[model samples]
Target: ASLARAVERLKAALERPKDEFIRDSAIQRFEFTFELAWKTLKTFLELQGLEARSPRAAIRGAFQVGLLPEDPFWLEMLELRNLTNHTYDEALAERIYAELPKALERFQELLRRLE
Candidate 1:
């Protein structure tokens, strides 16, 4: 529920008007959401003895542990995150907006895994 709330805040921030203020605000929100999601995901994986520092590492660990779903979207998101890290430009924000939903989708899948 806390993750859900963070996501909701992220969505709200994303819906803000696209001006200097909102663009900057949205970037901050994205980082916050990303931080929250990364921490949650890492925690879940670590609880299963899969410690990882990146999305790719975590996903690979999950797959090794038979915890990953059949879909490859999570892996794709990890690649996108990797690209953003290298680029670090406006495109990074755009890529974040594009790829984040998939990460969320995989996150929901993980929730189902927990259940």
Candidate 2:
């Protein structure tokens, strides 16, 4: 669970150091960190004899098990991560970058639960 070191790197990347480079790096960090988020939850559910077959499924399973709230935020989280794969949109990147801290908080919430 402690293997995801990308969170702090993301924090460092987004420290008001506004630039395309910094913003892009923060986006990458958010990608990996959020990837770690649902994957960790997937494994947790697996151990509990539940299967989270997809990232969305994992989030759904999480909410079903009372591990998360039944909100669209997690669904949006999955979609944004999916968006970051191989395509780059300046506006969308900026938007996702802007939302990274909130995503980080949700990821941290998962960590809190597992701990």
Candidate 3:
């Protein structure tokens, strides 16, 4: 329920007009949604006896089991999440905000796979 709710909240933020405040709000939502994404992925993999202790590890395990495409996109999201945690670049935030719309699809898909 948490992951689903987080996805819905992220979508809600994304639906608003992109003012600076909305941009930040949506990005914040994106951050937590991403958190729950990898964690949920970890759980899914673990249920199959796979181990994933970190976000990258979880993404790797997810693809290993065919839950994700064999591409660097999810890893890129992990990198973006890392950036959001430690850096404060306005341009980088805007760039990541733009990408959130695209990222939402996979988050949605993850839910679909589990359900």
Candidate 4:
């Protein structure tokens, strides 16, 4: 639920003019969305008798179970999500901001699968 809202705001942020504040907000939303996404996957997988203790593990398990695609970008999203935790470097933030749209697409794809 919250993940869906975050993705919607991320879409809105992407539609706006590229600005520092907007980019920052988008990145922040992406971080939260990614967190919820993996945790949700983890919980769902647990219910299915799979134990994935971390984001990477959950993502891999999801792929194995046919819940997600075999795309590498999902792993990249995990990396970017972790990167966001360590720094506010403008360049890094910008890179993450740029990736949000595609990430949101992937997220929405997963949501559709779950539905």
Candidate 5:
């Protein structure tokens, strides 16, 4: 629920103009969206008796638990999340922002699949 709220807020913000002092703030929100999305997945997996130490493992285990489709796209998102933790480059951030919509779309699709 919390992650859903974050994603909602981020998506809403994406539709608005960012203030001058807050360049790339949408990317930051997207990054949090990724974190919260994974955390939600992790919690769900834990409830289902699966545990994972890493983000990649979590996604893989999600597939094993029938929580998500086993797909190559998970690897790409996990790598992008990992990269976000290591630096503060605008070009890379912009790349991430550009790529985020599809990732969020995938997340929504997974929830629908679960439903």
Candidate 6:
């Protein structure tokens, strides 16, 4: 699925040497992957008889339903995902780049649960 491919691309980007291009690509991929992940989570939760109309709701519902473990990173990812749209701060992008590996791990965890 698209989410899987995005995650893979992000992983590949992570392996690349740190450069502006690679870092930007990785962050963009993360934004895409995170969007798909939450939307997928929303739909999946709905099919399971849960109401998850937004990213925050989907995340809370995911945790409530045992689809994900209790962690702050999911919320952090949501915050970054929102920030992705409004600004292009180098420092923020760098921060996201630094946080990406752990975000990828959390995403992978969700993928495993779905599988």
Task: Choose the strongest candidate by lDDT.
Answer: 6
User: Residue by residue across 1-115, what tens digits does model 6's lDDT show?
Assistant: 6788878988999999999999899999998899889999998999999999999999999999999989888999999898877646788888888999999999899989988
Give the alpha carbon lDDT tens digit for every residue of 8-34 in model 3: 999999998899888888889889999
- Superposed by TM-score, candidate 1 places the C-alpha of residue 48 at a distance from the truth, in angstroms, of 2.7
Model 6: CA > 4 A from native? none
C-alpha TM-scores of all predictions: 0.58, 0.88, 0.92, 0.93, 0.79, 0.95
**What RMSD value applies to candidate 1?**
3.7
Model 5 agreement with the true structure over 1-105: per-residue lDDT tens digits: 576677776667566765522336666776787777777777878888888767777888888987787788888988877776654665777677667677777
Reference-based TM-score, model 6: 0.95
How far off is residue 39 in model 4, in Å? Answer: 0.7
The alpha-carbon deviation from the true structure for residue 43 of candidate 3, after best TM-score superposition, in angstroms, is: 1.2
Candidate rank order under TM-score: 6, 4, 3, 2, 5, 1
lDDT of 2 by residue, 34-115 (tens): 8777788888889888989889889989998888877788888888888887446688888888788888777767767777
For model 5 the local lDDT of residue 47 reads 83
User: Candidate 1 local accuracy as lDDT?
Assistant: 0.63
Which stretches of candidate 2 lie above 4 Å from their native place?
1-4
lDDT of 4 by residue, 1-115 (tens): 6667777877888888988888888887787788889999998899999999999999999999999989999999999998997655778887777788889899989888977
* Winner by TM-score: 6
The residue pairs found clashing in candidate 5 are none
Pairing residues by index, what is the TM-score of model 4? Answer: 0.93
lDDT of each: 0.63, 0.80, 0.86, 0.87, 0.72, 0.90
Q: C-alpha displacement of 44 in model 6, angstroms?
A: 1.0
> Which ranges in model 1 have alpha carbons more than 4 Å from their true place?
14-27, 82-88
- Number of clashing residue pairs in every model? 0, 0, 0, 0, 0, 0
